[PDB]
Design a protein around this ligand. Structure first.
Ligand SMILES: [K+]
Ligand SMILES: [Mg+2]
Ligand SMILES: [Mg+2]
Ligand SMILES: [Mg+2]
Ligand SMILES: [Mg+2]
Ligand SMILES: [Mg+2]
Ligand SMILES: [Mg+2]
Ligand SMILES: [Mg+2]
Ligand SMILES: [Mg+2]
Ligand code: NA
Ligand code: NA
Ligand code: NA
Ligand code: NA
Ligand code: NA
Ligand code: NA
Lengths: 122, 142, 73, 163, 46
RNA sequence: AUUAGGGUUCGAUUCCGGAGAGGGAGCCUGAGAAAUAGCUACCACUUCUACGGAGGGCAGCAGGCGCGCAAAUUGCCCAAUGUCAAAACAAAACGAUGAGGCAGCGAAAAGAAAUAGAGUUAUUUCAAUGGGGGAUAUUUAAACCCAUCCCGAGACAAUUGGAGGACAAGUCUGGUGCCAGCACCCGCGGUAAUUCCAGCUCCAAAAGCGUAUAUUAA
């Protein structure tokens, strides 16, 4: 029974997307509204072929309750989303690259090879 | 009468004030580098030292009493001063060859009360406050 | 400025006198500054005369100005 | 390091900490309005002082001056909005008569008491702190909230409250 | 005269503070003060 | 910072400029250096060795030792702001960055605010809950915090200085007897202490309050 309002709408043909601010109102909830529920409702209201092509982030619940605000992007294709999205945002949504090993181990390995020459290097 | 009032006489007035400013005891002490040279603390607010002896200084007239004092040697500059142990029966907390923290008495060099020639005070012994031990809020280490 | 000394060869010393205002005492103060100028042979200034000088490139250790005009007395 | 957030102080301790005539006058205000400590009273003294010095500088030194028409009506707009001044009075001389009790009236804790929602000023304090009171459908928990005159008729109970 | 150190404090009789009900804190104490003084000083018995 | 006006005082420290990299000289490369996580020599310290020899420069970031009255973690990350460059992102296919960010410790300093409320005949009746514990969840690079929702009261119990005067507040009660001690100054104590040591009561500020040293005002 939540209501979604969209403000400051713009069309980005450079990155093949639409960016807007999404506001959500509700009367009483068992905590916070999950981002997936807003994603499902946003797809229905905007009539997109697939709900897995709208990304939401940065949600702030107002003091007193009954209101949240955030940012959202709707991509024209699923391929556009998989290309222009940051690796951390797409990791929340399911499809992301594996986390690289610890940076400390890279620094020690790189410095160790600085003394060698030719083979036995990488 | 006692002033120059010319329009172009700013140089005379500048020199008159600069010279007469040395007659201030407070101003001259601040602006003289010889200051804090005779100060045992060296210009700081507190100092640490080692207790070497216990003494008893009589009170100046018209008061009759024996004020319990302690002779300490500072560590930073190795000077010798006389400090005061304020509270009742607090002499038993201090022993010889003990590290103490020393602060001033309140008048910046001047002596305080009827104690003659004493301008310091003991505020901590063996890393624990003297007043904390007096109220039994802590205990003497070791 | 005013010519102060002409004891060198093709060189003079000029002096600028002004009043400096001290804000605290609301009164003035006499001050002066001395400059070394190159005197061309086209001019023959005497001590006490007024001259007009103009800035140029360093011509010596101390000289940075050149005499352009001289006013008699 | 390399942080440019600002901060300042809002109150000031009084000179002469043991005036008998000041000590009892401040005690009347503290118990009449339910204030917790004397720091609340000293806070109001600071903002009142800032208002007066702006007016006194602006009053007669610059005469009819572009620096008088500006921020001469802004203060009146500011004073009228919160209710610190009478509507009829519209000259900068009449802002110098503002007193401490006048500013203390336009407080959320005081407004609730005079609106009948709360029986006593101490009861009003516990209601605000309990999130049982809202202004324009917004929960307010700060008893120091200076209620503007426009929102005077908007204060009521909270929808999410049991009351 | 270092022998007489703490002569008085080590010979005064020992008494213990009584147990009393707690007092209100914060604004609940200022109202208690305002109730007594206004809306009716330390006087001792003879 | 303080101040009616006139002034006094501070400025190692976030932005701008100058100078330095244990001390002192000299130089190569380069558009640009008299460069120091470049080179050469000397002086003072200092490390490994098979004794032939070869090395070092934290006033970069964390960590130690000493010095003092005096100052944090040998943590996480390049997600944001930027720099460099043979470089847009994705596709076998993820540039580096102790600059910078963000968590820990941290009553420097600065804001907001708990320690209840309404009644009944002195002694029992109500309602409200925040600390706290959890949540489909939210936040975040991942965390955290915060916000939002829900099992929980009438010990979850406030301290620090004072009570002759300056200066608000006892003619209260024991103990001591120019002793112990108090006292910023004046002054209390010599067997009836308005001032010491304690009990009770009261006063001021209050999650703060005393002390010391410098400085501004007076
Ligand atoms: K980066
Ligand atoms: Mg609620
Ligand atoms: Mg200066
Ligand atoms: Mg710089
Ligand atoms: Mg370091
Ligand atoms: Mg410190
Ligand atoms: Mg850093
Ligand atoms: Mg007493
Ligand atoms: Mg009095
Ligand atoms: Na400076
Ligand atoms: Na340099
Ligand atoms: Na280095
Ligand atoms: Na790539
Ligand atoms: Na944070
Ligand atoms: Na001064």
């Amino acid at each position: 029974e939540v209501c979604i309002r969209t403000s400051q709408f713009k069309v980005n043909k450079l990155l093949n997307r639409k960016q807007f601010i999404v506001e959500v109102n509700h009367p009483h909830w068992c905590g916070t509204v999950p981002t997936q529920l807003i994603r499902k409702k946003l797809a229905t209201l905007y009539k997109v072929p697939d709900a897995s092509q709208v990304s939401l982030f940065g949600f702030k619940t107002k003091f007193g309750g009954g209101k949240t605000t955030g940012f959202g992007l709707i991509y024209d294709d699923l391929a556009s989303l998989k290309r222009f999205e940051p690796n951390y945002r797409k990791t929340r949504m399911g499809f992301g690259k594996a986390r690289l090993p610890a940076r400390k181990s890279v620094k020690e390995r790189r410095n160790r090879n600085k003394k060698l020459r030719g083979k036995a290097k990488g | 009468m006692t002033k120059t009032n010319g329009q172009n006489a700013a140089r005379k007035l500048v020199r008159l004030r600069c010279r007469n400013r040395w007659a201030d005891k407070g101003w001259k002490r601040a602006h003289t580098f010889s200051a804090r040279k005779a100060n045992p603390f060296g210009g700081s607010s507190h100092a640490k030292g080692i207790v070497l002896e216990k003494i008893g200084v009589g009170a100046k007239q018209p008061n009759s009493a024996i004020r319990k004092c302690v002779r300490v040697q500072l560590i930073k500059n190795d000077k010798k001063i006389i400090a005061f142990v304020p509270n009742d029966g607090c002499l038993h907390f201090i022993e010889e060859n003990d590290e103490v923290l020393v602060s001033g008495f309140g008048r910046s060099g001047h002596a305080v009360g009827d104690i003659p020639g004493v301008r310091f005070k003991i505020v901590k012994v063996s890393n624990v406050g003297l007043y904390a031990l007096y109220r039994q809020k802590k205990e003497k280490p070791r | 400025g005013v010519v102060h000394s002409t004891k060198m060869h093709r060189t003079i010393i000029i002096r600028r006198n002004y009043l400096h205002f001290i804000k605290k005492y609301q009164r003035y103060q006499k001050r002066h500054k001395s400059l070394a100028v190159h005197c061309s042979p086209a001019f023959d200034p005497k001590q006490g005369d007024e001259v007009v000088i103009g800035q140029c490139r360093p011509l010596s250790k101390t000289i940075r100005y050149n005499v352009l005009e001289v006013v008699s007395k | 390091m390399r942080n440019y957030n600002n901060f300042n102080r809002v109150w000031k301790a009084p000179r002469r900490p043991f005036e008998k005539e000041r000590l009892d006058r401040e005690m009347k205000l503290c118990g009449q309005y339910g204030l917790r400590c004397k720091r609340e009273i000293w806070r109001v003294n600071m903002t009142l002082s800032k208002m007066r010095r702006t007016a006194r500088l602006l009053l007669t030194l610059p005469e009819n001056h572009p620096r008088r028409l500006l921020e001469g009506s802004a203060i009146m707009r500011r004073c009228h909005e919160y209710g610190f001044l009478d509507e009829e009075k519209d000259k900068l001389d009449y802002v110098l008569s503002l007193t401490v009790p006048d500013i203390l009236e336009r407080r959320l804790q005081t407004i609730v008491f005079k609106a009948g929602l709360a029986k006593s000023v101490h009861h009003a304090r516990v209601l605000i702190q309990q999130r049982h009171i809202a202004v324009a459908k917004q929960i307010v928990t700060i008893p120091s909230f200076i209620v503007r005159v426009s929102s005077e008729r908007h204060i009521a109970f909270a929808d999410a409250s049991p009351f | 005269s270092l022998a007489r150190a703490g002569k008085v404090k080590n010979q005064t009789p020992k008494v213990a503070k009584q147990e009393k009900p707690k007092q209100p804190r914060g604004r609940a104490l200022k109202r208690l003060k305002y109730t007594r003084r206004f809306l009716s000083m330390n006087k001792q018995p003879p």
